[PDB]
């Protein structure tokens, strides 16, 4: 087991964090594309 698991976290969520980190570690010249991706539009409709 990993630390993130058992802690309630799943792998997609890990990948999420990992992928974002790599982004924040880029340089404006490639930082633009960051927006043209990693969206968050989707909205939950739970009933």
């Amino acid at each position: 087991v990993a630390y993130w698991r058992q802690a309630g976290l799943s792998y997609i969520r890990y990948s999420q964090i990992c992928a974002k980190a790599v982004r924040d570690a880029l340089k404006t010249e490639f930082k633009a594309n960051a927006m043209k991706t990693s969206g968050s539009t989707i909205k939950i409709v739970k009933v």
Partner: protein, 131 residues
């Protein structure tokens, strides 16, 4: 000859390319898939990808996470949520980032919160390696 496919949701690096070998960062070490390796499945880890092309001087890449697959046939597919060449990474930033993370951790008690910080630390830390 193995058909190697390496890509991210956004960019594709290799598509059924005949590469002699590839080095990928997994949760359990860094497996080196060869033109003829036994079938397997593995989840990625913040690290480095090394693609020994057909002609020497290999190409490097950085991966945040994702998956890798080796099938019965000599077909392999590496899929990273995000994969970039070192060519586009600022080392200076990573440092600044590993610092902050290790700081938040020192201020977190929440197990889940900590996990999210820990993971971040691991990633940013892994950034130092090829940079």
């Amino acid at each position: 000859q193995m058909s190697f496919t390496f890509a991210s949701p956004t960019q594709v690096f290799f598509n059924s390319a005949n590469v002699r070998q590839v080095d990928v960062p997994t949760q359990t070490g860094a497996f080196g898939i060869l033109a003829a390796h036994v079938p397997t499945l593995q989840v990625l880890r913040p690290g480095l990808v090394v693609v020994h092309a057909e002609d020497g001087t290999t190409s490097k890449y950085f991966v945040s996470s994702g998956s890798v697959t080796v099938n019965a046939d000599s077909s392999v597919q590496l899929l990273a949520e995000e994969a970039v060449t070192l060519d586009m990474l600022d080392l200076g930033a990573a440092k600044a980032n590993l610092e902050k993370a290790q700081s938040e951790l020192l201020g977190a008690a929440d197990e889940a919160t900590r996990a999210e910080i820990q993971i971040r630390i691991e990633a940013n830390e892994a950034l130092v390696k090829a940079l």
